[PDB]
Design a binder for this molecule. Structure first.
Ligand SMILES: CC(=O)N[C@@H]1[C@@H](O)[C@H](O)[C@@H](CO)O[C@H]1O
Ligand SMILES: CC(=O)N[C@@H]1[C@@H](O)[C@H](O)[C@@H](CO)O[C@H]1O
Ligand SMILES: *[C@@H]1O[C@H](CO)[C@@H](O)[C@H](O)[C@H]1NC(C)=O
Lengths: 275, 288, 9, 100
């Protein structure tokens, strides 16, 4: 692959409960590597993955200044949004931002992203051409007129084509043996009676990275896509992931059921069965 | 420790109103208040506020440095650790100081401006406060020069978060939480980077009599409003922008019959954002 | 590296 | 505003084996707004030294968090996760099932 870098900002007001708060997290693919939280006594951008820790003091200082400025900007954006939507200053509101870049195997830019939301709904987004906006409502149309008047999209495009790609390449290098070496799932099937006439077969995949994976149940080679319980892929807490797929089968017919596992760490797809 | 806050503002005039809230364990109930001096003597004879404490109308007695402790049943003391400190400053207690901007109130984005507060009264401290809800004032010590006391507040690098209406206050030695009346307000506007509009005169800039002159501000950027400003004197005037057939947004400012001309500039701005303007247009000298 | 581009709404 | 109720999974980092050190996880996701209260419980009692991941969100803007604590499972000790959110009238409690 084929990788991505993303930053996620959450700016929240909470009158009477706290000062407005800004939290930022940075991801390379499914791995978080930095964080900033304005509530800390002395807020700093901080490492959240080992492969970024040996990055120099210039990096942390620069990123800390940038985050402090961004926090200021988003507190003001919360006030502005209050005016745009004619809302009271007593309520709690949230602005969210996600942005970043996708690159191909050759490290070159594939796509840039920059999207904003207000109270969990689309607010305004940079288009794929990285030179125009889509505004979701009239408030956002105000923002759009400002940003067009200020040539904001040019500056963002410059970031996404330049720094975003260069740094993603650098991080992919820094963390190569975790970020670019898929960890295949450890797999197994468990069996649990439900009644005297039915039972559950559960196919497990554990300790895999990246998060993308496909678990399917087949019955004599035909997908049970209608009768499969699929749990959301979940973090294990050690920068690997977990998932399972379950199917209810009639008792004594377990042997006719097969679990199929697909993941990039696997050379060829796996087919497991219970005993 | 609880979160103590003042609503709508810790800087509050006499006769106004302010509410202290103590948020602790997802609750606004059951807290006591302390002033900084007697940091273990709960005020009002150890009164337990069942709800948020409403000071109204505000008096000079309300001024001070507060912390709160929330109810904590099972603990060595029946109460929490001290909250964050909130300073209630009560204004309107002395003659107002004066506030001016150097070099001016229109500040280019990214640049710095000096807001000078001064008075003939010997204020020990000056406070600069941007008007708005939950804003923290800046404090400086009053310098003394030839019988006037003064302080220079540096504001910048300029951005929208620093733009707005500012007032400055003085305080005297023994009542640090009591502020003067506010200075006359100063509107600090950030300009740019929004592209400058074009300013023209119709039928032209040379007028005597008897003759009508109209100043048009125009831009292909979608400003909602235009501001016409004359160098010195005459106050700021503003009009809605109207989109024309050629997709320019334009406003026409008719002058006269008085106006003795001068050097004019115009600015664009957007709805619900009165303190951020475009770059200034080229100057236009109007001659009567 | 985070974006140096933060503008107001 | 748009309110979204949290999804909850409670599970161990590794397959449970009585008497072996492990991690207990409570993954909450798909919720909005961001404020939420999560406690891990051991026999009904709040575990104190619990940590969580930094707040983040998915493409649909909904939030997710992982809460986790080190723990050593036994046959008798029963673990669970307790979650409150604006969308919930009462806190939800999801028991840890070693098979889930
Ligand atoms: C006087 C003032 O403006 N702020 C004070 C602060 O200096 C002090 O540390 C705090 C202790 O409770 O009380 C408040
Ligand atoms: C593209 C175009 O022709 N735009 C015109 C502009 O040149 C002119 O100065 C203005 C005056 O109304 O009207 C518009
Ligand atoms: C304060 O600002 C004024 C006005 O710009 C300037 O003349 C003066 O040198 C500054 N410093 C002092 C101490 O007055």
């Amino acid at each position: 692959g084929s990788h991505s870098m993303r930053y996620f900002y959450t700016a929240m007001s909470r009158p009477g409960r706290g000062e407005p708060r800004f939290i930022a997290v940075g991801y390379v693919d499914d791995t978080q590597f930095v964080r900033f939280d304005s509530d800390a006594a002395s807020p700093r951008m901080a490492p959240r993955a080992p492969w970024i820790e040996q990055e120099g003091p210039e990096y942390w200082d620069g990123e800390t200044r940038n985050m402090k400025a961004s926090a200021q900007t988003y507190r003001e954006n919360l006030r502005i949004a209050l005016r745009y939507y004619n809302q009271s200053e007593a309520g709690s509101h949230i602005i969210q931002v996600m942005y970043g870049c996708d690159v191909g195997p050759d490290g070159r830019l594939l796509r840039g992203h920059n999207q904003y939301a207000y109270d969990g709904k689309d607010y305004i987004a940079l288009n794929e051409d990285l030179s125009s906006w889509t505004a979701a409502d009239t408030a956002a149309q105000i923002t759009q007129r400002k940003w067009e008047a200020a040539r904001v999209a040019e500056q963002l495009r410059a970031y996404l084509e330049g720094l975003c790609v260069e740094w993603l390449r650098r991080y992919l290098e820094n963390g190569k043996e975790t970020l670019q070496r898929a960890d295949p799932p450890k797999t197994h099937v468990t069996h649990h009676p439900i009644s005297d006439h039915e039972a559950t077969l559960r196919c497990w995949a554990l300790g895999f990275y990246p998060a993308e994976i496909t678990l399917t149940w087949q019955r004599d080679g035909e997908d049970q896509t209608q009768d499969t319980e699929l749990v959301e892929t979940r973090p294990a807490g050690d920068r690997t992931f977990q998932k399972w797929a379950a199917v209810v089968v009639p008792s004594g017919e377990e042997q006719r059921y097969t679990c199929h596992v697909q993941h990039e760490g696997l050379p060829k797809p796996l087919t497991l069965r219970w005993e | 420790k609880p979160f103590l806050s003042a609503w709508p503002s810790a800087v509050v005039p006499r006769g106004g109103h302010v509410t202290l809230r103590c948020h602790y364990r997802h609750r606004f109930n059951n807290f006591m208040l302390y002033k900084e001096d007697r940091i273990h003597i709960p005020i009002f004879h150890g009164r337990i506020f069942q709800e948020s404490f409403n000071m109204s109308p505000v008096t000079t007695a309300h001024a001070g440095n507060y912390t709160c402790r929330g109810s904590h049943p099972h603990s060595p003391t029946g109460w929490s650790a001290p909250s964050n400190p909130v300073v209630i400053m009560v204004t309107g207690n002395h003659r107002k100081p004066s506030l001016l901007a150097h070099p001016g109130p229109l500040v280019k984005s990214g640049e710095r401006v000096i807001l000078q507060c001064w008075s003939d009264i010997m204020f020990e401290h000056f406070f600069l406060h941007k008007e708005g809800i939950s804003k923290d004032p800046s404090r400086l010590v009053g310098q003394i020069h030839d019988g006037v006391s003064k302080a220079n507040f540096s504001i910048g690098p300029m951005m929208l978060a620093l733009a707005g209406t500012y007032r400055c206050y003085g305080s005297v030695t023994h009542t640090p939480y009591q502020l003067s009346a506010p200075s006359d307000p100063l509107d600090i506007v950030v300009t740019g980077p929004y592209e400058k509009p074009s300013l023209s005169a119709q039928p032209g800039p040379k007028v005597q009599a008897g003759e009508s002159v109209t100043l048009s501000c125009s831009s292909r950027s979608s400003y909602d409003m235009y501001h016409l400003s004359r160098e010195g004197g005459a106050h700021e005037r503003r009009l809605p922008a109207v989109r024309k057939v050629n997709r320019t947004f334009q406003a026409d400012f008719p002058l006269g019959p008085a106006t003795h001309g001068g050097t004019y500039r115009c600015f664009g701005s957007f709805r619900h954002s009165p303190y951020e303007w475009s770059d200034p247009s080229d100057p236009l000298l109007v001659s009567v | 590296l985070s974006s140096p581009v933060t503008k107001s709404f | 505003m748009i309110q979204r109720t949290p999804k909850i999974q409670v599970y161990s980092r590794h397959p449970a084996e009585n008497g072996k050190s492990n991690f207990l996880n409570c993954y909450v996701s798909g919720f909005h707004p961001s404020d939420i209260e999560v406690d891990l419980l051991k026999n009904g009692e709040r575990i104190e030294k619990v940590e969580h991941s930094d707040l983040s969100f998915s493409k649909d803007w909904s939030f997710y968090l992982l809460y986790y604590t080190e723990f050593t499972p036994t046959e008798k000790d029963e673990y669970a996760c307790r979650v409150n959110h604006v969308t919930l009238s009462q806190p939800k409690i999801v028991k840890w099932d070693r098979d889930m």
